[PDB]
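$ run holo --ligand "sodium ion" --emit tokens
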Amino acid sequence: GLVPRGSHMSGATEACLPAGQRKSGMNINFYQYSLKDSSTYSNAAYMAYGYASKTKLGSVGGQTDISIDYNIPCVSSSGTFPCPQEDSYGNWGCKGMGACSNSQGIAYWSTDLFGFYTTPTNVTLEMTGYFLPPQTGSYTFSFATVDDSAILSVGGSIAFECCAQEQPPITSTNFTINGIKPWDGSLPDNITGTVYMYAGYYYPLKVVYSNAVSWGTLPISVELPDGTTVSDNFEGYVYSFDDDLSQSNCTIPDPSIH
Ligand SMILES: OC[C@H]1O[C@@H](O)[C@@H](O)[C@@H](O)[C@@H]1O
Ligand SMILES: OC[C@H]1O[C@H](O)[C@@H](O)[C@@H](O)[C@@H]1O
Ligand SMILES: [Ca+2]
Ligand SMILES: [Ca+2]
Ligand SMILES: [Cl-]
Ligand code: NA
Ligand code: NA
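-- output --
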């Protein structure tokens, strides 16, 4: 045939072609989350959108290194140093530091998350931007682990609306990766999700992440169509655009036929 037939049953992921000035990296918004609240983040509506009904603490833009690896302090005999969780032991010490005099269960303030001074022990944050595939094909996004709760969403009308990156969150719960902390706190069923993408279109991307206490972890990766993996540093793949609600042609409801 002259033209491709298109993905079946309108199944292509919606993408975007924003016409404005592209910015490298994602925007990170931070919102209040209560220390040791082990229920709010179990919820889908909260992780999709309800987080933004909490106080907004601040934001930072232009972030290309997006994994989280927050370690609480150990107030040790030799000073205060961050403790990798796997090195913690007893009640409690940190291997190579001896016993720690401080509590695991209080809030701690740090710039570890994106340079923004907040409480990484207890916070929710929303990463938004557009993923630019260099290759047409299947992309597999993954979280290596999740501590405490996270989702990843890809696509127009799923992550956010085309050319409307800065708007309040949309209500879609059609997550690409559902990493929500289960009520009965095992691991989530699946912390990887696949999207078929067409090169050169901008795909809305949203990550929402919550920590309730102590350590926080979210190692983010994507496997490209060519089989290579990009981990943590997404420079060259993620971008931001200021809203332009007036750009009529911004949404591409089916890239395969566009
Ligand atoms: O923790 C989130 C991000 O914080 C930034 O300031 C850098 O340290 C990144 O390497 C890290 O991925
Ligand atoms: O699961 C509740 C909790 O368990 C541990 O205390 C640590 O792994 C925390 O980071 C985690 O939030
Ligand atoms: Ca829409
Ligand atoms: Ca935690
Ligand atoms: Cl030790
Ligand atoms: Na860690
Ligand atoms: Na520290």
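-- notes --
The pocket of sodium ion (ligand 7) is lined by residues 73, 80-82 (CB under 6 Å).
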